[PDB]
């Protein structure tokens, strides 16, 4: 008649808020004889013995939900992976709350991982909403993180399946290098100016410095970044007038904990109304038998529909992501973050503030400038393409035909013979 | 086991070229991959003998 | 160097044959101190994994971990990948859940598997479909994960193959089927070859709906991967007898030969890396407590005793050993074909019918047709080596060519045919709309009776 | 275009042993009476005639 | 006339063996001869078939 909830939480004030939310979860659910216990664990700077302590403590506690709620970690790995893997050995849902990596989106790897935050590729759909507003077709993709790069390419092809257009340039490379300005100039020679960037803070600051030194931040250059690219030294290296995104209550932990408590509590009270109740065994010593209602409780969590919370309509898709997310659209006006738009789950509305661009007017810059110098290639056709060597140095002998027509030649460039 | 093109099509699809100005033999295979313009030349085939 | 081989098995596989796997193996020993530690584990919990890793990593700095699994848990390989990411030790997965295919590795992890991924398996299955001219097909994808990569790989493979595949649109799913909206998509199916990517408990309901909708006919084919086909003992009765599967589970090569090949790869990598850099043994001292020269991108070039055991960029084998099996009428996964380096071998080149999938299937529509090699009638030529496909007017056939006169064993070489009677037979197949079974005779000429024997 | 023609595979197997790099190589080879026929466009050979 | 083979029903359909004969239909004009009660089920099955 008890339900245990495991948590990896640091601060004592948010532990008290979590215990208060557990205590208030049994308020409106009547005088039913179910009980709710909570067990929270603290930090150690390592990761192997942390995984050991948490996994055997949650085996000895026999919990149903495992929560990790640590945004400001000094290690940039952001890996609650081993506790989720240990719970996936018995198919126990771990509700991740902080990270947004696309490696957690693979349910074949993370068998029993759920989360209430989407990955950044859904922001590209918001950027596809830009394509629904500003009517721009040709884009320039730049992704350094190859763990999420294939998922970003997949989401981009899924978005472009509707219009049946094609991305003009895609780029994937190893993060850490600095001489990527050649591909930046190759994208500069293209007609489009739409710049989509998906990397960490260091590569974003590197390409900001590369665009600042080569002046790729002038008129018409479309810049469109996210929350990871407007933090750290990338915010210092950002040009004025850049358009970015903001997660509403993305780092606000206190209401997020209460939302997670409400989700887990209504999931448990939904599961108590059905049959075939199983319990996690003492899997540390002599128990390798899996928890048989793993996918059953996962199917319970699939159809979880909610109506409570400050954020709003939290809802899981087939990937277990977040539906109907309020986003903000920010602008950098003279090294100051200025809000220029709001976003409900389907539509963008700009606010009363104006949209000041890094180029000219406040309207949208049509960054689709066709090539005024069309690169012409041809084969040496014998009666059609006459190729003559130069006389002295790069010159053409202006000979005249028998019908009074002067031959208007052109300075072309060509190889001499075959490759052997 | 990947299909690739070469020649003028290989230099055009790589982005290094913009417009092939050449007597392009219009067929059904290349029409599936790129768009075609109106033909300026109209002729057939023949056999060169001595 | 110091390599530990721990095995979690239920079958009585002893340990002393691993002690005998040290002596005659590595006769040309380039490391001066090669030692093995053979251990057997009875439980399969990750607590024992962490405990034995902390024992053997502190056990005189073991740099090699080899694990095989007997259970059906794919999370054990993910735990060993996390252990290889934390401890920076090259760890190899041999059998079972240690060899189950995972999607994406990490540069921090040096874990590797001796298996066959779903992409190379899809390549082999589309090679099978190309070798049979089964160009009109379909694709049904459920909500089982790892499915959009499968669809995209099929799309790129159709866009990069000389067939020009007549592919029906993808039948997609959202939940367990209501048989209301999925019924319309299943009733769009009129093609023969049906591809599917799901789990086993989903596949039971899929095959039950297909039998309920009559999709298990003699014309209709069913090709499934190795991830849906689980234990060889657990076969439910709802499977159609003739179910095509491709799995790398080879019973001819035991676990001892596979771990011997893994030890050969480890010693090859150690001997080739010792020739480049000196201070090669570098591991972590102990688990309690708060790397440059690695073998993560070094043993791509490897070949042990002539066996092409090279490694991919994703961490899998370049040329694994795929096994094509079917389901016979005796409800057993019958071993049929094996796979070469890049090309495909077929022990049964004659494609069997298995026309009676159930008991009440009265069907007599196939026709056995044989002809003779004559020049103005049946032009018999080789298959095109550029396409490995008979061109659209030519039809494939077989010819049982013997090797010698010493043995009666031969091979059914597949060739292309055109001409007059080929066009006659194709127009008969256009008009009557039947199914034909074309092959060649190897006895000889038209006919002659020798003592009541034609 | 001949590869699409599924009834002239004999010419496809015959011409693959003598394919040249450029058409001017074929003009020079038939100029030395080493070739005998060459499929080509009309007006180019009309201008060369 | 180009007449396809006669699709003969047997009982109230299991939608297993009759569907095999219904998927053989590639013609345009479908000629149905039945009563009013079975016609609803036949038209619903044909709408489910597309
Ligand atoms: C935020 O939510 C509101 C209410 O759900 C949305 O309003 C409806 O949105 C749908 C889809 O765009 C429209 O078809 C309806 O006509 C809208 N209802 C109304 C007001 O008639 C709204 O679109 C969302 N975003 C905003 C504020 O635009
Ligand atoms: C309830 O949780 C508390 C805090 O984690 C723990 O000390 C206690 O063991 C649990 N309840 C029991 C079993 O008394
Ligand atoms: C090397 O990086 C610098 C960064 O400023 C850049 O200016 C330069 O173009 C790069 N060189 C190449 C080869 O791209
Ligand atoms: C940098 O800005 C100057 C004007 O201050 C401009 O002339 C130059 O073209 C810019 N650099 C490039 C190559 O964009
Ligand atoms: C955001 O933060 C505050 C303080 O933590 C708290 O009220 C709650 O978590 C959120 N609500 C707002 C908008 O104040
Ligand atoms: C538990 O599941 C099984 C299999 O679906 C079912 O037969 C049984 O009725 C369920 N238990 C109860 C008490 O409903
Ligand atoms: C976004 O916020 C507004 C104001 O709180 C709210 O009305 C709306 O429901 C939110 N968006 C969602 C969750 O659809
Ligand atoms: C280019 O080819 C011409 C003609 O054979 C030759 O005269 C010239 O030397 C070549 N260019 C080189 C190799 O510098
Ligand atoms: C096998 O299981 C027993 C408990 O029954 C345990 O003591 C032992 O350590 C296990 N390991 C071996 C030696 O297989
Ligand atoms: C691979 O390794 C062998 C070791 O002798 C070496 O000779 C060869 O050059 C290398 N290259 C290949 C074939 O990958
Ligand atoms: C298999 O092995 C041979 C010999 O090394 C090699 O030449 C061939 O390319 C490989 N491919 C085949 C035929 O499977
Ligand atoms: C049998 O093998 C011998 C080996 O020399 C060969 O000469 C002979 O032609 C073979 N017979 C046939 C025709 O298979
Ligand atoms: C092998 O058998 C063939 C059958 O036609 C025959 O022609 C040939 O002479 C035989 N070879 C010998 C010499 O055994």
Copy the structure tokens of residue E22.
């219904």
CA of D35 to nearest chain B CA: how many angstroms apart? 8
- Please list the residues that pair with C67 across neighbouring strands: C6, C93
Neighbours of C54 (CB within 10 A): 19
Q: Is the separation of the CB atoms in C370 and C437 below 8 Å?
A: no
Q: Is the separation of the CB atoms in C46 and C79 below 8 Å?
A: yes
Give the long-range contacts of residues A200-203, CB within 8 A, separation 24 or more.
Answer: A200/A76, A200/A144, A200/A145, A200/A175, A200/A228, A201/A228, A201/A229, A201/A231, A201/A232, A201/A233, A201/A234, A202/A175, A203/A144, A203/A175
Residues in chain B: 50
Q: Is the separation of the CB atoms in C308 and C212 below 8 Å?
A: no
Which residue is closest in CA terms to ligand 5's atom 2?
A: A252
Torsion on CA atoms C235, C237, C240, C246, rounded to nearest 10: -10
Reading phi first (left if > 0) and then psi (alpha if -120 to 50, else beta), residue A260 is in alpha
What phi, psi does C69 have (nearest 5°)?
-125, 145
Q: Which residues contact A395 (CB under 8 A, 6 or more apart)?
A: none
User: Residue C95, annotated ligand binder?
Assistant: yes
| Interior angle at CA A266, CA A261 and CA A268, nearest 5 | 95
Q: Which residues contact A327 (CB under 8 A, 6 or more apart)?
A: A123, A126, A245, A246, A247, A248, A342, A343
Question: Ligand 3 center to residue A181 CA distance, Å?
Answer: 6
Q: Which chains touch B (3 or more CB pairs under 8 A)?
A: A, C, D
Q: Find out whether the beta carbon of C340 lies less than 6 Å from any atom of ligand 11.
A: yes
Copy the structure tokens of residue B21.
């100005």
User: Residue C437, annotated ligand binder?
Assistant: no
Contact B23 D36 (CB under 8 A): no
Q: Which residues line ligand 2 (CB under 6 A)?
A: A 37, 39
CA distance A323 to A320: 9
Which residue is closest in CA terms to ligand 12's atom 10?
A: C404
Q: Find out whether the beta carbon of A347 lies less than 6 Å from any atom of ligand 1.
A: yes
Copy the structure tokens of residue A233.
């030294």
Q: Which chains touch C (3 or more CB pairs under 8 A)?
A: A, B, D, E
CA of A82 to nearest chain B CA: how many angstroms apart? 38
Copy the structure tokens of residue A246.
């903001």
CA distance A223 to A241: 9
Contact C46 A49 (CB under 8 A): no
Consecutive H or E run containing E36: helix E36-49
Reading phi first (left if > 0) and then psi (alpha if -120 to 50, else beta), residue A63 is in beta
CA distance C415 to A24: 77
User: Among the atoms of ligand 5, which is closest to the Cα of residue A310?
Assistant: 11
Copy the structure tokens of residue B5.
């093109």
Closest by CA to C228, choosing from C220, C239, C237, is: C239
Helices (H), A36-168: 48-61, 81-89, 121-133, 146-163
Contact D47 A418 (CB under 8 A): no
CA distance A410 to B3: 35
- For chain E, how many helices (H) and strands (E)? 2, 0
DSSP for residue C307: B
Q: Is the separation of the CB atoms in D21 and A418 below 8 Å?
A: yes
Q: Which residues contact C24 (CB under 8 A, 6 or more apart)?
A: none
CA distance C240 to A289: 31
Reading phi first (left if > 0) and then psi (alpha if -120 to 50, else beta), residue E15 is in left
Closest by CA to C196, choosing from C149, C151, C140, C246, is: C140
CA distance C197 to C225: 7
Q: Is the separation of the CB atoms in A219 and A365 below 8 Å?
A: yes
* β strands within A100-210, DSSP E: 113-115, 140-143, 194-198
Contacts of A416 in chain D (CB under 8 A): none
Q: Is the separation of the CB atoms in A151 and A104 below 8 Å?
A: no
C-D contacts (CB, under 8 Å): 6
Sheet holding A337-343, edge to edge: A140-143, A194-198, A222-224, A243-247, A327-332, A337-343, A348-350
Closest by CA to C297, choosing from C105, C78, C116, is: C105
Q: Which residues contact A302 (CB under 8 A, 6 or more apart)?
A: A316, A318, A320, C175
Helices (H), C58-147: 75-87, 118-131
- Contact of chains B and A by CB distance (3 or more pairs under 8 angstroms): yes
Q: DSSP 3-state assignment of C317?
A: strand
Copy the structure tokens of residue A128.
């596809």
CA distance A264 to A114: 11
Nearest ligand to the C-alpha atom of residue C342: 11
What phi, psi does C172 have (nearest 5°)?
-100, 155
- CA atoms A70, A74, A79, A80: torsion sign: negative
Q: Is the separation of the CB atoms in A224 and A199 below 8 Å?
A: no
For C186, the closest chain E residue by CA position comes to E49
CA distance C116 to C70: 17
Q: Which residues line ligand 7 (CB under 6 A)?
A: A 312-313, 324, 326, 344-345
CA distance C54 to C286: 7
**Residue entry with tokens 């997020």:** A256
Sheet holding A94-96, edge to edge: A35-41, A2-8, A65-68, A94-96, A113-115
For B33, the closest chain C residue by CA position comes to C159
CA distance C306 to A128: 53
Half-sphere exposure of A358 (CA within 13 A, CB side): 22
Q: Is the separation of the CB atoms in C171 and C141 below 8 Å?
A: yes
Q: Find out whether the beta carbon of A276 lies less than 6 Å from any atom of ligand 6.
A: yes
The structure was resolved experimentally with cryo-EM
Copy the structure tokens of residue C429.
């197949």
**Residue entry with tokens 């089964």:** C134
Q: Which residues contact A180 (CB under 8 A, 6 or more apart)?
A: A173, A206, A207, A210
End-to-end CA distance of chain A: 83
Q: Which residues contact C279 (CB under 8 A, 6 or more apart)?
A: C293
Q: Is the separation of the CB atoms in C119 and C375 below 8 Å?
A: no
Q: Which residues contact A277 (CB under 8 A, 6 or more apart)?
A: A293
Q: Which residues contact A379 (CB under 8 A, 6 or more apart)?
A: A385, B7, B8, B22
Q: Does B1 lie at the interface with D, CB-CB under 8 angstroms? A: no
Q: Which residues contact C292 (CB under 8 A, 6 or more apart)?
A: none
- DSSP assignment string, C275-291: TT-S--------SS---
DSSP for residue A250: S
User: Residue C249, annotated ligand binder?
Assistant: yes
Measure CA C42 to chain center: 29
- Please list the residues that pair with C113 across neighbouring strands: C93
Copy the structure tokens of residue C235.
């076969």
Residue C182 buriedness (CB in 10 A; 0-12 / 13-18 / 19+):
buried
CA distance A300 to C200: 20
Neighbours of C20 (CB within 10 A): 11
CA distance A336 to A359: 17
Closest by CA to C263, choosing from C111, C48, C86, C94, is: C94
Across A123-154, b (16+ Cβ under 10 Å) vs e yields bbbbbbbbbeebebebbbbbbbbeebbbbbbb
What phi, psi does C400 have (nearest 5°)?
-85, 90
Q: Does D7 lie at the interface with C, CB-CB under 8 angstroms? A: yes
Consecutive H or E run containing C52: helix C46-57
Copy the structure tokens of residue C384.
């095109």
CA-to-CA dists, residue A135 to A129, A138, A158, A164, A341, angstroms = 9, 10, 18, 14, 17
CA distance C210 to C208: 5
Q: Which chains touch E (3 or more CB pairs under 8 A)?
A: C
Residues in chain C: 454
- DSSP assignment string, C394-454: -EEEEEEEES-SS-S-EEEEEEEEEEHHHHHHHHHHHHH--EEEEEE--S-SS---SSS--
CA of C104 to nearest chain A CA: how many angstroms apart? 8
Residues in chain D: 49
CA-to-CA dists, residue C363 to A219, C219, C240, C367, C435, angstroms = 73, 10, 16, 12, 12
Contacts of A169 in chain B (CB under 8 A): 15
Torsion on CA atoms C145, C147, C148, C154, rounded to nearest 10: 160
User: Residue C233, annotated ligand binder?
Assistant: yes
CA distance A69 to C260: 45
Closest by CA to C147, choosing from C198, C181, C186, C112, is: C198
Closest by CA to C431, choosing from C441, C442, C423, C439, is: C423
Reading phi first (left if > 0) and then psi (alpha if -120 to 50, else beta), residue C310 is in beta
DSSP for residue A17: H
Q: Is the separation of the CB atoms in C246 and C226 below 8 Å?
A: yes
Residue among C78, C79, C142, C151 with most chain A CBs within 10 A, to mutate: C78
CA distance C379 to C421: 9
Closest by CA to C249, choosing from C223, C226, C225, C224, is: C226
Q: Does D30 lie at the interface with B, CB-CB under 8 angstroms? A: yes
Q: Is the separation of the CB atoms in C268 and C304 below 8 Å?
A: yes
What phi, psi does C430 have (nearest 5°)?
-70, -40
Q: Is the separation of the CB atoms in C117 and C138 below 8 Å?
A: no
Copy the structure tokens of residue E1.
């006339």
CA distance C235 to C326: 13
Q: DSSP 3-state assignment of C178?
A: coil
Contacts of C391 in chain D (CB under 8 A): 6, 9
Q: Which residues line ligand 4 (CB under 6 A)?
A: A 214-215
Instruction: Provide Rg for chain B, Cα atoms.
Output: 14
Which residue is closest in CA terms to ligand 2's atom 7?
A: A39
Q: Which residues precede chain breaks (C–N over 2.5 Å) in chain C?
A: 290
Contacts of C385 in chain D (CB under 8 A): none
What phi, psi does C325 have (nearest 5°)?
-125, 160
Instruction: Provide Rg for chain C, Cα atoms.
Output: 26
Pairing of strands C136-141, C166-172: parallel
What phi, psi does C340 have (nearest 5°)?
-90, -160
Q: Is the separation of the CB atoms in C261 and C307 below 8 Å?
A: yes
**Residue entry with tokens 């199914």:** C435
Q: Is the separation of the CB atoms in C103 and C120 below 8 Å?
A: no
Question: Ligand 6 center to residue A276 CA distance, Å?
Answer: 6
């Amino acid at each position: 008649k008890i339900v245990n909830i495991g948590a990896v939480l640091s601060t004592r004030k948010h532990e008290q808020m979590f215990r208060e939310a557990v205590n208030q979860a049994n308020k409106r659910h009547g005088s039913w004889k179910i009980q709710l216990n909570a067990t929270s664990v603290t930090h150690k700077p390592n990761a192997i013995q942390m995984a050991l302590s948490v996994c055997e403590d949650l085996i000895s506690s026999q919990v149903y939900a495992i929560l990790v709620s640590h945004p400001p970690t000094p290690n940039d790995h952001f890996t609650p992976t081993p506790v989720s893997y240990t719970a996936g050995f018995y198919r126990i849902p771990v509700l991740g709350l902080t990270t947004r990596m696309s490696i957690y989106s693979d349910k074949s790897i993370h068998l029993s991982f759920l989360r209430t935050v989407p990955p950044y590729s859904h922001q590209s759909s918001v950027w596809f909403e830009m394509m629904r507003v500003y009517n721009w077709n040709h884009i320039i993709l730049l992704v350094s993180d190859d763990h999420e790069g294939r998922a970003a390419q997949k989401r981009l092809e899924t978005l472009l399946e509707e219009r049946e257009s094609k991305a003009e340039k895609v780029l994937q490379f190893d993060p850490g290098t600095k001489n990527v300005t050649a591909l930046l100039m190759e994208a500069r020679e293209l007609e489009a100016r739409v710049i989509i960037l998906s990397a960490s803070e260091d590569d974003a600051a590197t390409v900001y410095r590369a665009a600042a030194m080569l002046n790729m931040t002038g008129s018409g250059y479309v810049w469109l970044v996210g929350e990871r690219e407007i933090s750290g030294n990338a915010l210092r290296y950002a040009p004025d007038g850049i358009i970015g995104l903001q997660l509403i209550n993305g780092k606000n932990e206190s209401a997020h904990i209460s939302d997670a408590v409400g989700v887990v509590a209504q999931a448990v009270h939904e599961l108590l109304e059905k049959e075939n109740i199983t319990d996690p065994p003492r899997g540390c010593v002599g128990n390798t038998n899996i928890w048989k209602t793993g996918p059953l409780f996962k199917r319970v969590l699939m159809s979880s529909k909610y109506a409570d919370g400050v954020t709003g309509r939290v809802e899981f898709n087939e990937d277990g992501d977040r539906k109907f997310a309020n986003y903000s659209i920010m602008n950098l006006q003279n090294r100051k973050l200025v809000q220029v738009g709001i976003y409900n789950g389907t539509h963008v509305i700009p606010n009363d503030r104006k949209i000041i661009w890094p180029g000219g007017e406040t309207e949208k810059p049509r960054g689709y400038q066709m090539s005024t110098r069309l690169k012409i290639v041809t084969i040496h056709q014998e009666p059609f393409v006459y190729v003559k060597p130069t006389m002295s140095d790069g010159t053409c002998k202006e000979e005249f035909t028998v019908n009074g027509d002067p031959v208007k030649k052109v300075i072309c460039t060509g190889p001499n013979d075959t490759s052997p | 086991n990947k299909k690739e093109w070469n020649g003028m099509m290989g230099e055009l699809l790589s982005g290094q070229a913009d417009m092939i100005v050449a007597p392009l033999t219009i067929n059904n295979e290349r029409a599936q991959y790129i768009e075609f313009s109106k033909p300026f030349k109209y002729q057939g085939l023949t056999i060169l003998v001595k | 160097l110091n390599i530990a081989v721990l095995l979690g098995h239920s079958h009585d596989v002893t340990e002393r044959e691993l002690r005998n796997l040290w002596g005659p193996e590595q006769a040309t020993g380039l490391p001066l101190d090669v030692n093995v530690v053979a251990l057997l584990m009875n439980r399969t919990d990750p607590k024992s994994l962490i405990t034995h890793v902390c024992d053997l990593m502190s056990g005189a700095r073991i740099h090699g971990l080899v694990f095989g699994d007997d259970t059906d848990q794919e999370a054990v390989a993910q735990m060993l990948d996390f252990i290889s990411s934390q401890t920076f030790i090259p760890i190899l997965g041999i059998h079972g859940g240690a060899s189950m295919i995972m999607a994406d590795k990490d540069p921090t992890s040096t874990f590797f598997q001796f298996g066959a991924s779903i992409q190379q398996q899809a390549t082999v299955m589309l090679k099978i479909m190309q070798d049979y001219d089964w160009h009109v097909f379909s694709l049904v994808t459920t909500i089982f994960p790892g499915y959009r990569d499968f669809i995209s790989f099929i799309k790129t493979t159709v866009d990069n193959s000389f067939v020009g595949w007549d592919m029906q649109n993808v039948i997609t799913l959202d939940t367990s089927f209501e048989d209301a909206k999925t019924q319309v998509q299943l009733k769009k199916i009129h093609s023969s070859v049906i591809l599917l990517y799901c789990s086993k408990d989903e596949a039971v309901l899929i095959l039950s709906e297909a039998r309920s909708l009559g999709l298990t006919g003699y014309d209709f084919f069913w090709i499934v991967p190795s991830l849906v086909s689980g234990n060889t003992e657990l076969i439910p009765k709802e499977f159609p007898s003739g179910l095509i599967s491709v799995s790398y589970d080879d019973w001819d090569y035991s676990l001892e030969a596979r771990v011997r090949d893994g030890l050969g790869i480890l010693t090859t990598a150690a001997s080739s890396m010792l020739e480049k850099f000196s201070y090669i043994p570098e591991a972590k001292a102990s688990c309690y407590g708060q790397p440059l020269h690695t073998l993560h991108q070094f043993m791509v070039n490897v070949t042990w005793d002539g066996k092409d055991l090279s490694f991919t960029e994703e961490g899998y084998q370049v040329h694994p050993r795929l096994v094509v099996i079917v389901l016979n009428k005796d409800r057993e996964w019958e071993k049929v074909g094996k796979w070469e380096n890049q090309t495909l071998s077929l022990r049964h080149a004659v494609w069997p019918r298995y026309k009676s999938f159930s008991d009440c299937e009265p069907d007599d529509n196939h026709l056995s047709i044989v002809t003779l090699e004559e020049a103005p009638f049946v032009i018999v030529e080789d298959i095109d080596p550029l396409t490995e496909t008979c061109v659209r007017n030519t039809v494939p056939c077989r010819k049982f060519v013997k090797i010698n006169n010493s043995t009666n064993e031969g091979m059914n070489v597949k060739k292309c045919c055109k001409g007059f009677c080929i066009d006659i037979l194709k127009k008969l197949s256009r008009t009557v709309k039947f199914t034909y079974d074309l092959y060649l005779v190897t006895n000889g000429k038209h006919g002659k009776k020798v003592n009541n024997v034609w | 275009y001949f590869r699409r023609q599924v009834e002239l595979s004999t010419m496809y197997r015959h011409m693959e042993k003598h394919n040249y790099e450029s058409a001017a190589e074929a003009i020079q080879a038939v100029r030395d009476n080493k070739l005998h026929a060459f499929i080509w466009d009309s007006a180019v050979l009309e201008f060369e005639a």
